[PDB]
Design a protein around this ligand. Structure first.
Ligand SMILES: [Mg+2]
Ligand SMILES: [Mg+2]
Ligand SMILES: [Mg+2]
Ligand SMILES: [Mg+2]
Ligand SMILES: [Mg+2]
Ligand SMILES: [Mg+2]
Ligand SMILES: [Mg+2]
Ligand SMILES: [Mg+2]
Ligand SMILES: [Mg+2]
Ligand SMILES: [Mg+2]
Ligand SMILES: [Mg+2]
Ligand SMILES: [Mg+2]
Ligand SMILES: [Mg+2]
Ligand SMILES: [Mg+2]
Ligand SMILES: [Mg+2]
Ligand SMILES: [Mg+2]
Ligand SMILES: [Mg+2]
Ligand SMILES: [Mg+2]
Ligand SMILES: [Mg+2]
Ligand SMILES: [Mg+2]
Ligand SMILES: [Mg+2]
Ligand SMILES: [Mg+2]
Ligand SMILES: [Mg+2]
Ligand SMILES: [Mg+2]
Ligand SMILES: [Mg+2]
Ligand SMILES: [Mg+2]
Ligand SMILES: [Mg+2]
Ligand SMILES: [Mg+2]
Ligand SMILES: [Mg+2]
Ligand SMILES: [Mg+2]
Ligand SMILES: [Mg+2]
Ligand SMILES: [Mg+2]
Ligand SMILES: [Mg+2]
Ligand SMILES: [Mg+2]
Ligand SMILES: [Mg+2]
Ligand SMILES: [Mg+2]
Ligand SMILES: [Mg+2]
Ligand SMILES: [Mg+2]
Ligand SMILES: [Mg+2]
Ligand SMILES: [Mg+2]
Ligand SMILES: [Mg+2]
Ligand SMILES: [Mg+2]
Ligand SMILES: [Mg+2]
Ligand SMILES: [Mg+2]
Ligand SMILES: [Mg+2]
Ligand SMILES: [Mg+2]
Ligand SMILES: [Mg+2]
Ligand SMILES: [Mg+2]
Ligand SMILES: [Mg+2]
Ligand SMILES: [Mg+2]
Ligand SMILES: [Mg+2]
Ligand SMILES: [Mg+2]
Ligand SMILES: [Mg+2]
Ligand SMILES: [Mg+2]
Ligand SMILES: [Mg+2]
Ligand SMILES: [Mg+2]
Ligand SMILES: [Mg+2]
Ligand SMILES: [Mg+2]
Ligand SMILES: [Mg+2]
Ligand SMILES: [Mg+2]
Ligand SMILES: [Mg+2]
Ligand SMILES: [Mg+2]
Ligand SMILES: [Mg+2]
Ligand SMILES: [Mg+2]
Ligand SMILES: [Mg+2]
Ligand SMILES: [Mg+2]
Ligand SMILES: [Mg+2]
Ligand SMILES: [Mg+2]
Ligand SMILES: [Mg+2]
Ligand SMILES: [Mg+2]
Ligand SMILES: [Mg+2]
Ligand SMILES: [Mg+2]
Ligand SMILES: [Mg+2]
Ligand SMILES: [Mg+2]
Ligand SMILES: [Mg+2]
Ligand SMILES: [Mg+2]
Ligand SMILES: [Mg+2]
Ligand SMILES: [Mg+2]
Ligand SMILES: [Mg+2]
Ligand SMILES: [Mg+2]
Ligand SMILES: [Mg+2]
Ligand SMILES: [Mg+2]
Ligand SMILES: [Mg+2]
Ligand SMILES: [Mg+2]
Ligand SMILES: [Mg+2]
Ligand SMILES: [Mg+2]
Ligand SMILES: [Mg+2]
Ligand SMILES: [Mg+2]
Ligand SMILES: [Mg+2]
Ligand SMILES: [Mg+2]
Ligand SMILES: [Mg+2]
Ligand SMILES: [Mg+2]
Ligand SMILES: [Mg+2]
Ligand SMILES: [Mg+2]
Ligand SMILES: [Mg+2]
Ligand SMILES: [Mg+2]
Ligand SMILES: [Mg+2]
Ligand SMILES: [Mg+2]
Ligand SMILES: [Mg+2]
Ligand SMILES: [Mg+2]
Ligand SMILES: [Mg+2]
Ligand SMILES: [Mg+2]
Ligand SMILES: [Mg+2]
Ligand SMILES: [Mg+2]
Ligand SMILES: [Mg+2]
Ligand SMILES: [Mg+2]
Ligand SMILES: [Mg+2]
Ligand SMILES: [Mg+2]
Ligand SMILES: [Mg+2]
Ligand SMILES: [Mg+2]
Ligand SMILES: [Mg+2]
Ligand SMILES: [Mg+2]
Ligand SMILES: [Mg+2]
Ligand SMILES: [Mg+2]
Ligand SMILES: [Mg+2]
Ligand SMILES: [Mg+2]
Ligand SMILES: [Mg+2]
Ligand SMILES: [Mg+2]
Ligand SMILES: [Mg+2]
Ligand SMILES: [Mg+2]
Ligand SMILES: [Mg+2]
Ligand SMILES: [Mg+2]
Ligand SMILES: [Mg+2]
Ligand SMILES: [Mg+2]
Ligand SMILES: [Mg+2]
Ligand SMILES: [Mg+2]
Ligand SMILES: [Mg+2]
Ligand SMILES: [Mg+2]
Ligand SMILES: [Mg+2]
Ligand SMILES: [Mg+2]
Ligand SMILES: [Mg+2]
Ligand SMILES: [Mg+2]
Ligand SMILES: [Mg+2]
Ligand SMILES: [Mg+2]
Ligand SMILES: [Mg+2]
Ligand SMILES: [Mg+2]
Ligand SMILES: [Mg+2]
Ligand SMILES: [Mg+2]
Ligand SMILES: [Mg+2]
Ligand SMILES: [Mg+2]
Ligand SMILES: [Mg+2]
Ligand SMILES: [Mg+2]
Ligand SMILES: [Mg+2]
Ligand SMILES: [Mg+2]
Ligand SMILES: [Mg+2]
Ligand SMILES: [Mg+2]
Ligand SMILES: [Mg+2]
Ligand SMILES: [Mg+2]
Ligand SMILES: [Mg+2]
Ligand SMILES: [Mg+2]
Ligand SMILES: [Mg+2]
Ligand SMILES: [Mg+2]
Ligand SMILES: [Mg+2]
Ligand SMILES: [Mg+2]
Ligand SMILES: [Mg+2]
Ligand SMILES: [Mg+2]
Ligand SMILES: [Mg+2]
Ligand SMILES: [Mg+2]
Ligand SMILES: [Mg+2]
Ligand SMILES: [Mg+2]
Ligand SMILES: [Mg+2]
Ligand SMILES: [Mg+2]
Ligand SMILES: [Mg+2]
Ligand SMILES: [Mg+2]
Ligand SMILES: [Mg+2]
Ligand SMILES: [Mg+2]
Ligand SMILES: [Mg+2]
Ligand SMILES: [Mg+2]
Ligand SMILES: [Mg+2]
Ligand SMILES: [Mg+2]
Ligand SMILES: [Mg+2]
Ligand SMILES: [Mg+2]
Ligand SMILES: [Mg+2]
Ligand SMILES: [Mg+2]
Ligand SMILES: [Mg+2]
Ligand SMILES: [Mg+2]
Ligand SMILES: [Mg+2]
Ligand SMILES: [Mg+2]
Ligand SMILES: [Mg+2]
Ligand SMILES: [Mg+2]
Ligand SMILES: [Mg+2]
Ligand SMILES: [Mg+2]
Ligand SMILES: [Mg+2]
Ligand SMILES: [Mg+2]
Ligand SMILES: [Mg+2]
Ligand SMILES: [Mg+2]
Ligand SMILES: [Mg+2]
Ligand SMILES: [Mg+2]
Ligand SMILES: [Mg+2]
Ligand SMILES: [Mg+2]
Ligand SMILES: [Mg+2]
Ligand SMILES: [Mg+2]
Ligand SMILES: [Mg+2]
Ligand SMILES: [Mg+2]
Ligand SMILES: [Mg+2]
Ligand SMILES: [Zn+2]
Lengths: 64, 53
RNA sequence: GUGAAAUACCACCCUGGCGCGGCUGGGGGCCUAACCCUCGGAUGGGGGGACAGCGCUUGGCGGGCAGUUUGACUGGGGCGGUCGCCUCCUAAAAGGUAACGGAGGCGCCCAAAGGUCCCCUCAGGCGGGACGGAAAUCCGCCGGAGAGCGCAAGGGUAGAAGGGGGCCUGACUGCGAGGCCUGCAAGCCGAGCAGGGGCGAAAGCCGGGCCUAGUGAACCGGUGGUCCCGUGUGGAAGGGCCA
RNA sequence: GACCCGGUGAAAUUGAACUGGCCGUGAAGAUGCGGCCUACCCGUGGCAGGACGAAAAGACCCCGUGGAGCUUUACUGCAGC
RNA sequence: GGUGGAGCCUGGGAGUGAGGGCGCGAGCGAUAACGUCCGCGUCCGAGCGCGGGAACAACCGAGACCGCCAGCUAAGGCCCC
RNA sequence: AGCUGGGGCUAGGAGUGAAAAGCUAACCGAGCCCGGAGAUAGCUGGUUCUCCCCGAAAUGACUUUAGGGUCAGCCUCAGGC
RNA sequence: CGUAGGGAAACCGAGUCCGAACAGGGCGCAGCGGCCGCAAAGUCCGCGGCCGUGGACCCGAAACCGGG
RNA sequence: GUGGUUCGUGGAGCCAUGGGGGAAUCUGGGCGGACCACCGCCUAAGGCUAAGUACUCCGGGUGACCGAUAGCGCACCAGUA
RNA sequence: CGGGGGGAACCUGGGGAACUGAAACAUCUCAGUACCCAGAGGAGAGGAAAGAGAAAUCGACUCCCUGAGUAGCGGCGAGCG
């Protein structure tokens, strides 16, 4: 049977137009009061995932 | 932090929007904080008041 | 006259309290006919009696049975101890480097113990002085740092990062070239541009703290804000983004 | 019974065999490697010292995020009251 | 300088994630262990193919494409085997 | 409280049990058959023709992880520089 | 499937998102000879290695469950 | 109080119903994803209904299906001894 | 007049697990599948909108393709769809 798109990924990540994996930045969900403004500020942005891990997270998205 | 070294927020007293997050020591500063910070909403510094987190 | 409000009189409402009627909720007592047991006779007699039994439902007790969990490292397993973070060594003069190798600490803290401007320099030794001391504070000479820096240790440090004080909130918002580190993810440093401010005559410094620990990824949900989506349409329910 | 003769005739086991001893060596207990000693070829009745002999994929021990039985103030459910 | 089964980059397929002896530097151990735990290297692993070491995976020598009744050498050896 | 023939009844988380977890068709801590079924097995084993070139690892980090795995490391092939 | 991407989204669009910004940054944006031919993004069928789902390289449990 | 639907209480409608309460007849009522309104779709609580669809004990045609350890468990007196 | 029982699978209704997957496991999955029962037939079920759902449109039901592993569901885990 055809492959099933892994939703755990399509809800977290997004494949660009060139073949890269871009997921939001980890750290600023909670426990943020004493964090920097630089640390809260920078973590509110996407980051290109490491090539090996992204390659895996695209085989889970066979139809996007 | 602890139960005495609490947490708190700052509220641009002009537009009442909470903007920053810090802490104090309610035994060494039991009076509500009043600090003058910058509000991205009003786009000008403003006296901010300790509200509860 | 009089007070805020004023009187004969006629309604509509309250205060509370009293009797009839309503309609219900509890408790007591008695029926009977549902329902249950019983009676050579049964459309009936007799006892129980609207309780019990049973159905939907609430909450509890519940190894009686049912499905599972009961961590790893370990000079065999178990008992003991340990499990992440910081400092020094082992580490063989870059970085990194193991062992249940040797030594100690963190799970906080500061509204100043932050920022800036100005000023000041310690322990320690010798002599000197009421109370007054091996060390309370004053005077003198010597004293490159052995004091101090909130806390373990290290490196660092007076030509300040140490001590005093003045005005202050940069313990900013919006980003951020380039890099250390690096399996991922993280963690770390950061010039500079604009917004708006603070200290300074000015050059300039300021995106918390001399530094290295003082922490916890996603999932789920709470609070404020935004006003992006709103399941025929306008709203709302519920969400997403910001913190 | 065993042992000899006639009649019938199994078994587990079995890498292949042309299968000695001592001092050493080797995955640390050698018929099979090294050196030396010994030893003519094939058998029968016997004895059990070795082929770490046979048998049973160690009951012990640990390992596996294996299982199953029993247990309770382990967790969560069900009957039942 | 270096043209090497060298290096950089993108991409496909793996296996490995149980190492061991030796040498030097340490810790642990008793300035024990064919002990153990790290560091540089080496070898066996995968070279249990060859020579030496009596015999022996890792000490010395030396990297086996194949064939010769040809020659030179390394370690080690030259009285006899 | 005996032994015994014959006809009967009680069964699988259930029956019986003067109690051993004994018995229930020669192995009972949950019988046997058939089915779900080719359950699961991170464990052991087994994997079949030839020649040719290269040729490893047994490390680090995380891992209810330690005899298993994800990424990196070391090997390989095609293309490019 | 491809020809457009960026953004949680409305929505803009060779740009777009965070933003007050004409700032900065993220993810993005542009064939060869002499019209022709040649090459190509892409796509389609074959073949091959590998991966996902199923017993998925073969044999093997002790056990669980259902009906007899 | 549940079941079905992609919907595991989720903002939870729709379809179905075990328990309680309990209407109306077109000016009625169910629906369009809690709810209210506007706008629209439909007309439950009686029933019937061909073909296109599924299987293969049976008969036939045909195979880059097997060829007596293969192919159905049986090519033969096999669900037999 | 009719029913009762049989039929290899196929069909609908009443009931309905577990191993397994989630690298443990309880919600979850395996799956309303396997299995039991009643029924029917050459087919059975379903079926003529109190429907779908945004076209201001479609027009009973059944089946195949496609829509689509899209929308959504999910200890938002495995996976379901
Ligand atoms: Mg998108
Ligand atoms: Mg975050
Ligand atoms: Mg948040
Ligand atoms: Mg901090
Ligand atoms: Mg900051
Ligand atoms: Mg922001
Ligand atoms: Mg698609
Ligand atoms: Mg696309
Ligand atoms: Mg802050
Ligand atoms: Mg009475
Ligand atoms: Mg009652
Ligand atoms: Mg009754
Ligand atoms: Mg109950
Ligand atoms: Mg018990
Ligand atoms: Mg209990
Ligand atoms: Mg039991
Ligand atoms: Mg139990
Ligand atoms: Mg289970
Ligand atoms: Mg253990
Ligand atoms: Mg460890
Ligand atoms: Mg021990
Ligand atoms: Mg030992
Ligand atoms: Mg050991
Ligand atoms: Mg050890
Ligand atoms: Mg213990
Ligand atoms: Mg060093
Ligand atoms: Mg060194
Ligand atoms: Mg480095
Ligand atoms: Mg220890
Ligand atoms: Mg300090
Ligand atoms: Mg005195
Ligand atoms: Mg000092
Ligand atoms: Mg201290
Ligand atoms: Mg020094
Ligand atoms: Mg000062
Ligand atoms: Mg000051
Ligand atoms: Mg001022
Ligand atoms: Mg960078
Ligand atoms: Mg990095
Ligand atoms: Mg941090
Ligand atoms: Mg400025
Ligand atoms: Mg300025
Ligand atoms: Mg001034
Ligand atoms: Mg700065
Ligand atoms: Mg600090
Ligand atoms: Mg200071
Ligand atoms: Mg922590
Ligand atoms: Mg979770
Ligand atoms: Mg906006
Ligand atoms: Mg709407
Ligand atoms: Mg709107
Ligand atoms: Mg309106
Ligand atoms: Mg409103
Ligand atoms: Mg809302
Ligand atoms: Mg909201
Ligand atoms: Mg946030
Ligand atoms: Mg004779
Ligand atoms: Mg004889
Ligand atoms: Mg052998
Ligand atoms: Mg002999
Ligand atoms: Mg020896
Ligand atoms: Mg010997
Ligand atoms: Mg010999
Ligand atoms: Mg011999
Ligand atoms: Mg020989
Ligand atoms: Mg010999
Ligand atoms: Mg003999
Ligand atoms: Mg003997
Ligand atoms: Mg013997
Ligand atoms: Mg004998
Ligand atoms: Mg013996
Ligand atoms: Mg022997
Ligand atoms: Mg013996
Ligand atoms: Mg035996
Ligand atoms: Mg055995
Ligand atoms: Mg075994
Ligand atoms: Mg075994
Ligand atoms: Mg064994
Ligand atoms: Mg064993
Ligand atoms: Mg065990
Ligand atoms: Mg475990
Ligand atoms: Mg394990
Ligand atoms: Mg157990
Ligand atoms: Mg009972
Ligand atoms: Mg009782
Ligand atoms: Mg080359
Ligand atoms: Mg090479
Ligand atoms: Mg190489
Ligand atoms: Mg590669
Ligand atoms: Mg491992
Ligand atoms: Mg080992
Ligand atoms: Mg292994
Ligand atoms: Mg290892
Ligand atoms: Mg090692
Ligand atoms: Mg060793
Ligand atoms: Mg040796
Ligand atoms: Mg050594
Ligand atoms: Mg030497
Ligand atoms: Mg040495
Ligand atoms: Mg040494
Ligand atoms: Mg050492
Ligand atoms: Mg040694
Ligand atoms: Mg060892
Ligand atoms: Mg080791
Ligand atoms: Mg090996
Ligand atoms: Mg060699
Ligand atoms: Mg070699
Ligand atoms: Mg050799
Ligand atoms: Mg050999
Ligand atoms: Mg050999
Ligand atoms: Mg040799
Ligand atoms: Mg030799
Ligand atoms: Mg020799
Ligand atoms: Mg060479
Ligand atoms: Mg010569
Ligand atoms: Mg000699
Ligand atoms: Mg001789
Ligand atoms: Mg009898
Ligand atoms: Mg009898
Ligand atoms: Mg009998
Ligand atoms: Mg019975
Ligand atoms: Mg049973
Ligand atoms: Mg049974
Ligand atoms: Mg049964
Ligand atoms: Mg019982
Ligand atoms: Mg039997
Ligand atoms: Mg028996
Ligand atoms: Mg059992
Ligand atoms: Mg039996
Ligand atoms: Mg059966
Ligand atoms: Mg199954
Ligand atoms: Mg299992
Ligand atoms: Mg052959
Ligand atoms: Mg390793
Ligand atoms: Mg990791
Ligand atoms: Mg864990
Ligand atoms: Mg171990
Ligand atoms: Mg790898
Ligand atoms: Mg190449
Ligand atoms: Mg841009
Ligand atoms: Mg760019
Ligand atoms: Mg062409
Ligand atoms: Mg193709
Ligand atoms: Mg692959
Ligand atoms: Mg399968
Ligand atoms: Mg297979
Ligand atoms: Mg088998
Ligand atoms: Mg099996
Ligand atoms: Mg069980
Ligand atoms: Mg059981
Ligand atoms: Mg459900
Ligand atoms: Mg809820
Ligand atoms: Mg529901
Ligand atoms: Mg729907
Ligand atoms: Mg009902
Ligand atoms: Mg109407
Ligand atoms: Mg109406
Ligand atoms: Mg309705
Ligand atoms: Mg309704
Ligand atoms: Mg409605
Ligand atoms: Mg509707
Ligand atoms: Mg609606
Ligand atoms: Mg209407
Ligand atoms: Mg409708
Ligand atoms: Mg009607
Ligand atoms: Mg019908
Ligand atoms: Mg029909
Ligand atoms: Mg039909
Ligand atoms: Mg036929
Ligand atoms: Mg033929
Ligand atoms: Mg043939
Ligand atoms: Mg035959
Ligand atoms: Mg046959
Ligand atoms: Mg034949
Ligand atoms: Mg019939
Ligand atoms: Mg059904
Ligand atoms: Mg059941
Ligand atoms: Mg289960
Ligand atoms: Mg399975
Ligand atoms: Mg799985
Ligand atoms: Mg499965
Ligand atoms: Mg499982
Ligand atoms: Mg598993
Ligand atoms: Mg289990
Ligand atoms: Mg299911
Ligand atoms: Mg059924
Ligand atoms: Mg019947
Ligand atoms: Mg029938
Ligand atoms: Mg037909
Ligand atoms: Mg019909
Ligand atoms: Mg009709
Ligand atoms: Mg589609
Ligand atoms: Mg598609
Ligand atoms: Mg999730
Ligand atoms: Mg399902
Ligand atoms: Zn404001």
């Amino acid at each position: 049977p055809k492959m099933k798109t892994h939703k755990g990924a399509k809800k977290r990540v997004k494949i660009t137009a060139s073949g890269k994996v871009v997921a939001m930045k980890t750290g600023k969900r909670h426990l943020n009061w004493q964090k920097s403004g630089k640390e809260i500020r920078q973590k509110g942005r996407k980051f290109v995932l490491a090539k090996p891990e992204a390659e895996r997270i695209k085989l889970l998205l066979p139809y996007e | 932090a602890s139960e005495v070294r609490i947490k708190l927020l700052l509220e641009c007293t002009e537009c009442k929007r909470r903007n920053y997050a810090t802490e104090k020591n309610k035994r060494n500063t039991p009076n509500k904080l009043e600090l003058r910070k910058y509000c991205p909403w009003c786009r000008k510094h403003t006296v901010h008041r300790e509200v509860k987190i």
